[PDB]
Amino acid sequence: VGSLNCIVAVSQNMGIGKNGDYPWPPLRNEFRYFQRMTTTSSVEGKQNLVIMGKKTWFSIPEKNRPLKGRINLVLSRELKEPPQGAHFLSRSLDDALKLTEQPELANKVDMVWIVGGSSVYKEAMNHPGHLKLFVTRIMQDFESDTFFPEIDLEKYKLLPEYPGVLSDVQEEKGIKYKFEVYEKND
Ligand SMILES: NC(=O)C1=CN([C@@H]2O[C@H](COP(=O)(O)OP(=O)(O)OC[C@H]3O[C@@H](n4cnc5c(N)ncnc54)[C@H](OP(=O)(O)O)[C@@H]3O)[C@@H](O)[C@H]2O)C=CC1
Ligand SMILES: CN(Cc1cnc2nc(N)nc(N)c2n1)c1ccc(C(=O)N[C@@H](CCC(=O)O)C(=O)O)cc1
């Protein structure tokens, strides 16, 4: 019960993963940016909630699990309890959001960040209400086996700027990328 946002890093051909990992070499400032966006809460004494499907939870290195300073929720219909290190397990995105409204969490969470994977995004994308997409455009093609859903530009507007988000083209390990913010309201 705060903002609902999706954050993703996409190659030119819309890939986000390849054999359980992201397709390019590690980009430390892309990770630094992902960490600060998802960890920074807007209010005082609140923490943001991160929602992720199971394959995404297992692609984070064990040392980095759970993602520090955030409430980590995993989506799965197969698991019986949250994986080791996870704070909550939900069977569906609606239940994950119905949970935020439990007195439990109702007072602790600021923003909800959808961090993947593809089915998770596809659904938050069609979910109604106000939604922002924070897209990292990796400007090169990468062999992938999982993709980000098509952004409908009649519903999503690309913003010209956003506070805290660099506007220039970045480059790291010879890969250029840029940060984009899209907003919907329906
Ligand atoms: N570049 C980037 O930004 C990102 C890259 N990644 C990478 O992308 C790929 C992750 O892949 P993807 O296959 O899309 O995986 P998810 O992380 O979406 O895992 C899919 C599993 O999560 C559960 N799940 C997914 N959607 C839901 C739902 N709506 N309700 C309940 N359970 C759900 C199901 O678990 P079950 O079968 O147990 O029911 C499903 O088998 C990896 O390669 C990862 O490293 C991931 C995130 C962002
Ligand atoms: C598999 N993967 C998914 C992944 C990677 N890049 C992304 N980039 C963005 N922009 N959006 C995403 N949703 C995203 N997700 C991972 C892998 C590692 C960590 C992770 O270790 N993150 C640390 C960052 C520490 C660091 O490398 O600086 C954290 O505290 O956020 C996160 C996501």
From Swiss-Prot:
Consequence the record notes for mutating Q35K: Increases affinity for dihydrofolate about 3-fold. Reduces affinity for NADPH about 3-fold
The family database entries (Gene3D superfamilies) matched by this protein are listed as: Dihydrofolate Reductase, subunit A
Domain DHFR residues, every copy: 3-184
| Pathway noted in the entry | Cofactor biosynthesis; tetrahydrofolate biosynthesis; 5,6,7,8-tetrahydrofolate from 7,8-dihydrofolate: step 1/1
Q: Which GO BP terms, alphabetically?
A: axon regeneration; dihydrofolate metabolic process; folic acid metabolic process; negative regulation of translation; one-carbon metabolic process; regulation of removal of superoxide radicals; response to methotrexate; tetrahydrobiopterin biosynthetic process
Q: Which disease is it linked to?
A: Megaloblastic anemia due to dihydrofolate reductase deficiency: An inborn error of metabolism, characterized by megaloblastic anemia and/or pancytopenia, severe cerebral folate deficiency, and cerebral tetrahydrobiopterin deficiency. Clinical features include variable neurologic symptoms, ranging from severe developmental delay and generalized seizures in infancy, to childhood absence epilepsy with learning difficulties, to lack of symptoms.
What protein does this entry describe? Dihydrofolate reductase
Q: Provide the species name.
A: Homo sapiens (Human)
Recorded name of the encoding gene: DHFR
